[PDB]
Amino acid sequence: ALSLDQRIQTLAYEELNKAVEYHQAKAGTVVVLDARTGEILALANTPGRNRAVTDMIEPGSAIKPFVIAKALDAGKTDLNERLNTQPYKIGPSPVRDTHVYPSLDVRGIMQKSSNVGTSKLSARFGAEEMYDFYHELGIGVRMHSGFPGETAGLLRNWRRWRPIEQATMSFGYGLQLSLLQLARAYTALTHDGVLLPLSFEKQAVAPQGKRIFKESTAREVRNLMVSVTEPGGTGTAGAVDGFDVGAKTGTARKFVNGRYADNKHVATFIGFAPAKNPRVIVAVTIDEPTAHGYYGGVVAGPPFKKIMGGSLNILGISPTKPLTA
Numbered sequence: 001a002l003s004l005d006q007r008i009q010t011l012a013y014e015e016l017n018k019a020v021e022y023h024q025a026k027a028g029t030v031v032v033l034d035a036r037t038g039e040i041l042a043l044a045n046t047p048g049r050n051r052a053v054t055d056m057i058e059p060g061s062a063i064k065p066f067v068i069a070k071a072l073d074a075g076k077t078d079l080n081e082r083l084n085t086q087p088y089k090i091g092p093s094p095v096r097d098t099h100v101y102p103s104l105d106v107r108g109i110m111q112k113s114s115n116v117g118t119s120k121l122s123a124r125f126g127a128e129e130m131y132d133f134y135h136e137l138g139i140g141v142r143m144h145s146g147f148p149g150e151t152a153g154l155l156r157n158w159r160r161w162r163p164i165e166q167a168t169m170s171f172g173y174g175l176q177l178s179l180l181q182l183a184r185a186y187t188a189l190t191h192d193g194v195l196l197p198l199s200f201e202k203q204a205v206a207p208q209g210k211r212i213f214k215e216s217t218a219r220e221v222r223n224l225m226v227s228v229t230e231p232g233g234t235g236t237a238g239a240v241d242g243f244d245v246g247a248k249t250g251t252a253r254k255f256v257n258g259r260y261a262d263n264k265h266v267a268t269f270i271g272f273a274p275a276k277n278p279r280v281i282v283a284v285t286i287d288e289p290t291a292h293g294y295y296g297g298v299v300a301g302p303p304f305k306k307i308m309g310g311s312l313n314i315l316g317i318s319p320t321k322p323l324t325a
Contacts, residue, residue, distance in 0.1 A: 001202045003039035008032050011310045013044040016284070019303040020046050023289035025267075027051060030285075030303070031183040032311055035278040037203045038187055038196030041311070043180070052179045054149040057285065059182055060172035060252035061296075062270050064118045065189060065221055067170050068106055070133055071121040073217040077106060085109075085116045093164045095119050111227040113234050113249060115171040122170035130166055131158035136195075136212060137185045139177050143198070153177040172252065183283040186270060189225075189246075190278040193218040222246045226275045237301030238269055240309045242319030246278070247271030247304070249296035254288070264288060269300035273308055274320050282308045 012030045020028045029052045032042035045051045071077045082103045087096035097114045109117035122130060135141065140155035154176035156165075169175055180198070187196040193213035196206065213221075225246030228235040234249040250268035253260040267286045272278040284300040284307070293299050312319075 003034070003041060003200055003202050004043070005041045005314065007314045008307075008311050009042040009044065011314070012042040012307050015303045015306045015310075016044050017046060019284075019299070020286060022292060023286060023299050024291040025286045025299070026288035028284070028286040029055070029179045030307060031179050031281075031283040032307065033183055033187065033198070033281040033283075035187065035190035035272050035281045037206045038184070038191075038198040038209075039203055040180075040198060040200055041280075049149065050147055053143065053145050053147050054151075055178060056151060056153055056176035057179065057182075057266060057268075058172050058252045058255075059175055059177060060250035060266070060268060061113045061115075062182055062248050062250040062268050063170070063172040063175065064113065065110065065225060065248050066133075066137060066185060067118050067122050068110060068224070069189065069213050069217055069221045071124060072106070072220060073213045074125075076124040077121055079106060079220065081105060083109070083117050083120055085114050085120075087116055090164045090167070093168070095164075095167055107224050107227055110224045110248070111233045118170045119167040122166060127158045127161050127166050130169070131155065134169070134175060136210070137188070138181050138195070139175055141181075143178070143180055143184070145180070146200075150178075153181055172250065179283055179285050183270065183281055186272065186281050186283070188212045189218050189221055190272050190281060191218075222272075222275055222278070225271075229271070234295075235269060235271070235297045235301055237297050238271055238304045238308070240273060240305055240312070241325040242321055242323045243273045243309075243312065244275040244320060245271050245273045245308065246275040249301070251295045263294075265294045267294060267296045267299035269296050269304045271304060271308065273312060274317070276320070279315065279317055280308065280311050282311065
């Protein structure tokens with residue numbers, strides 16, 4: 001009794017391969033989950049290996065919602081604090097955003113994808129604490145999917161970390177996980193603070209998961225993530241008619257020839273809807289887009305929008321606001 005929904009799988013596979021063609025990308029992957037049970041509704045790749053489970057990627061900015069959640073959960077920040085987000089350096093390493101934002105509140109940090117803001121929240125925790133937190137999200141912990149070629153991913157031992165590393169981990173450098181592991185982590189935000197195991201089998205009742213955040217934290221973070229798909233956000237291309245969508249964009253520089261490249265990227269878009277009471281998670285990654293943009297929002301947003309809107313329809317979920325399209 002497989003959890004796969006054939007209509008969603010077909011939609012995912014078609015929209016993924018079309019986006020990869022349109023952006024003249026090298027490859028891509030899509031994961032669709034039930035946001036309340038962790039059932040895997042669709043898993044699609046471009047021709048070749050099962051990259052969704054086999055390929056380790058850097059999460060990039062798709063890790064930031066968890067850093068922000070953890071800071072709010074532990075009371076290290078709140079919705080009122082405006083953080084100084086001026087860029088800075090440690091030795092040769094910069095910690096900088098796409099623009100110089102003099103200050104942002106936590107909403108802004110999410111909305112604009114501020115690396116500086118995220119790093120400062122992370123810096124409020126000790127190294128070992130952050131290491132255990134990344135491990136609790138499942139980073140470095142094998143999925144045991146049943147598929148061959150699956151690895152655990154990479155979480156470097158905290159005793160080894162240089163001063164800069166905790167900072168750069170907070171915007172997704174140096175950690176490695178599969179798209180499936182990353183999609184799994186988002187269940188802690190959608191299932192009210194409780195991380196789910198994921199399953200290829202239909203579930204009559206949500207498995208027991210593991211609490212990572214307070215319900216209230218997860219609820220506030222989901223609302224912050226709606227800012228990503230609204231005007232002002234990095235992810236407006238992923239907005240879905242009739243629904244509020246909480247999402248996060250990511251754009252990761254590819255590490256090639258012992259060097260992070262200036263113009264070779266992995267584009268990611270992960271989101272859930274309905275934002276207040278989510279039922280579906282869709283996670284999209286596009287490797288090396290070379291036409292019509294390279295950022296997560298512009299490249300992976302449009303297929304996210306079609307896969308999410310279509311999935312909501314297939315599952316019979318009612319729009320939460322009037323339609324306009």
